Structure 1
Amino acid sequence: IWNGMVGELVYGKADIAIAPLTITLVREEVIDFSKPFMSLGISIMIKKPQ
Protein backbone atom coordinates (compact mmCIF):
# COMPACT_ATOMS: atom_id res chain seq x y z
CA ILE A 1 0.00 0.00 0.00
CA TRP A 2 1.55 3.28 -1.12
CA ASN A 3 1.13 6.48 0.88
CA GLY A 4 2.25 10.09 0.90
CA MET A 5 3.06 11.79 -2.39
CA VAL A 6 3.30 8.47 -4.23
CA GLY A 7 0.15 7.25 -2.50
CA GLU A 8 -1.82 10.24 -3.76
CA LEU A 9 -0.33 9.80 -7.23
CA VAL A 10 -0.98 6.05 -7.60
CA TYR A 11 -4.65 6.20 -6.56
CA GLY A 12 -5.14 9.09 -8.99
CA LYS A 13 -6.23 11.60 -6.35
CA ALA A 14 -4.03 14.26 -7.99
CA ASP A 15 -2.55 14.77 -11.44
CA ILE A 16 0.90 16.27 -10.79
CA ALA A 17 3.26 16.24 -7.80
CA ILE A 18 5.31 19.43 -7.38
CA ALA A 19 7.12 19.01 -4.06
CA PRO A 20 10.58 18.18 -2.68
CA LEU A 21 10.05 14.58 -3.80
CA THR A 22 13.33 12.77 -4.43
CA ILE A 23 13.71 10.61 -7.54
CA THR A 24 14.17 6.97 -6.53
CA LEU A 25 14.22 3.70 -8.46
CA VAL A 26 11.47 2.10 -6.36
CA ARG A 27 9.13 5.03 -7.05
CA GLU A 28 9.91 4.74 -10.78
CA GLU A 29 7.90 1.50 -10.88
CA VAL A 30 4.60 3.23 -10.03
CA ILE A 31 5.21 6.87 -11.00
CA ASP A 32 7.37 8.60 -13.59
CA PHE A 33 9.90 11.36 -12.95
CA SER A 34 11.11 14.43 -14.78
CA LYS A 35 14.76 15.44 -15.08
CA PRO A 36 16.26 16.64 -11.77
CA PHE A 37 15.61 20.36 -11.39
CA MET A 38 18.07 20.68 -8.48
CA SER A 39 20.89 18.73 -6.86
CA LEU A 40 21.03 17.64 -3.22
CA GLY A 41 22.38 15.03 -0.85
CA ILE A 42 21.68 13.44 2.51
CA SER A 43 23.51 15.21 5.33
CA ILE A 44 23.85 15.12 9.12
CA MET A 45 22.45 17.78 11.46
CA ILE A 46 23.36 18.49 15.10
CA LYS A 47 23.20 21.47 17.43
CA LYS A 48 26.22 23.67 16.86
CA PRO A 49 28.85 23.14 19.56
CA GLN A 50 28.39 25.38 22.57
Structure 2
Amino acid sequence: QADMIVAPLTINNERAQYIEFSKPFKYQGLTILVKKEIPRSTLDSFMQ
Protein backbone atom coordinates (compact mmCIF):
# COMPACT_ATOMS: atom_id res chain seq x y z
CA GLN A 1 0.00 0.00 0.00
CA ALA A 2 3.01 2.34 0.23
CA ASP A 3 6.37 2.12 -1.53
CA MET A 4 8.23 4.75 0.53
CA ILE A 5 7.98 6.16 4.05
CA VAL A 6 9.07 9.80 4.38
CA ALA A 7 8.73 10.16 8.14
CA PRO A 8 10.97 9.99 11.20
CA LEU A 9 11.79 6.27 11.39
CA THR A 10 14.55 5.46 13.86
CA ILE A 11 17.02 3.05 12.27
CA ASN A 12 16.71 -0.19 14.25
CA ASN A 13 17.92 -3.76 13.84
CA GLU A 14 14.47 -5.37 13.89
CA ARG A 15 13.28 -2.80 11.36
CA ALA A 16 16.32 -3.44 9.13
CA GLN A 17 15.89 -7.20 8.64
CA TYR A 18 12.75 -6.84 6.50
CA ILE A 19 13.15 -3.40 4.87
CA GLU A 20 16.19 -1.42 3.74
CA PHE A 21 16.71 2.13 4.99
CA SER A 22 18.79 5.02 3.65
CA LYS A 23 21.64 7.06 5.06
CA PRO A 24 20.23 9.18 7.90
CA PHE A 25 18.85 12.62 7.11
CA LYS A 26 19.23 13.70 10.76
CA TYR A 27 21.23 12.40 13.72
CA GLN A 28 19.76 12.41 17.22
CA GLY A 29 19.28 10.47 20.45
CA LEU A 30 16.79 9.73 23.22
CA THR A 31 16.32 12.27 26.02
CA ILE A 32 14.02 12.77 29.01
CA LEU A 33 11.48 15.58 29.35
CA VAL A 34 10.22 16.73 32.77
CA LYS A 35 8.43 19.81 34.07
CA LYS A 36 10.30 22.92 35.15
CA GLU A 37 9.55 23.85 38.75
CA ILE A 38 9.81 27.01 40.87
CA PRO A 39 10.44 29.56 38.09
CA ARG A 40 11.55 32.20 40.60
CA SER A 41 12.18 32.52 44.32
CA THR A 42 9.25 33.82 46.36
CA LEU A 43 11.17 36.17 48.69
CA ASP A 44 7.88 37.41 50.14
CA SER A 45 9.70 38.47 53.32
CA PHE A 46 12.31 41.06 52.38
CA MET A 47 13.56 40.59 55.97
CA GLN A 48 14.14 36.88 55.35
Q: Same fold by TM (over 0.5)?
A: yes
Find the counterpart in structure 1 of residue 31 from structure 2: 43
Gapped regions of structure 2 (runs ≥ 5):
39-48
Amino acid aligned to 1:14? A
TM-score computed with the length of structure 2 as normaliser: 0.72
Which has the bigger relative contact order, CA under 8 A and spacing at least 6?
1
Q: Which consecutive aligned stretches of 4+ in structure 1 deviate over 3 angstroms post-superposition?
A: none
TM-score computed with the length of structure 1 as normaliser: 0.70
The number of equivalent residue pairs is 38
1:21 paired with 2:23, answer: no
- The alignment-based identity, stated in percent, is 47
More helix as a share of residues: 1
Question: For residues 34 and 28 of structure 1, what CA distance do their matches in structure 2 show?
Answer: 10
Find the counterpart in structure 2 of residue 8 from structure 1: none
Let me know the Cα RMSD of the aligned residues: 0.8
Find the counterpart in structure 2 of residue 10 from structure 1: none
- Measure how far apart 1:49 and its partner are: 1.7
Report the structure number with the largest CA radius of gyration.
Answer: 2
